[PDB]
Structure 1
Amino acid sequence: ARVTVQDAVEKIGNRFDLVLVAARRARQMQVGGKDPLVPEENDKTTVIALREIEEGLINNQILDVRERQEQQEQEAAELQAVT
């Protein structure tokens, strides 16, 4: 569970970009295809995303890097699936 998000705020020092990054990660985990990077403790996707933010293994840059790597993998796999 979560009580305060001060650690997440100090790791992403804007208090507004934290909300957007956590929403992006939680939407990646909720639809989601992806799986949590932290041991889930019967927490919902937003809380898991914030707990990942606390550990410093997720931020905006890491999410963008992973998204572009996944886009490159999708481009490659479709390339060899057709031609």
Structure 2
Amino acid sequence: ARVTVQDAVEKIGNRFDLVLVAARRARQMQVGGKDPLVPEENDKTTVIALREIEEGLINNQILDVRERQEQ
């Protein structure tokens, strides 16, 4: 997440979709109001989202399933 983002690219699949997934996740924390799945460690929402993606807790299918569950 910091210095290098190569870890998350190999998990999402390509660079152009990682940006969209990370932005969608980060807007939830910044404005919507949600809690991180990882320790905050004094980071900005973009870096927290990248860390969550790197761990394996966030991708498109999970967000879609959660949105369906909410409604």
Superposition deviation, residue 32 in structure 1? 2.2
State the structure with bigger RCO (CA 8 A, min sep 6), 1 or 2: 2
Give every structure 1 segment of 4 or more consecutive aligned residues whose post-TM-superposition deviation is greater than 2 Å: none
Structure-1-length-normalised TM-score:
0.78
Deviations 1:19-63 (A, max 9, x none): 000000000000022111111110000000000000010001111
Larger Rg over CA atoms? 1
Partners of 2:3 and 2:46 in 1: how far apart? 13
Deviations 1:4-31 (A, max 9, x none): 1001101101111110000000000000
Counterpart of 2:37?
37
RMSD: 1.0
Deviations 1:56-76 (A, max 9, x none): 1000111111111xxxxxxxx
Structure-2-length-normalised TM-score:
0.90
Percent of paired sites with the same residue: 100
Q: Give structure 1 stretches of 5+ with no counterpart.
A: 69-83
SS in 2 for 1:37: coil
Q: Give structure 2 stretches of 5+ with no counterpart.
A: none
Counterpart of 2:27?
27
Q: Give the count of matched residue pairs.
A: 68
Partners of 2:23 and 2:54 in 1: how far apart? 14
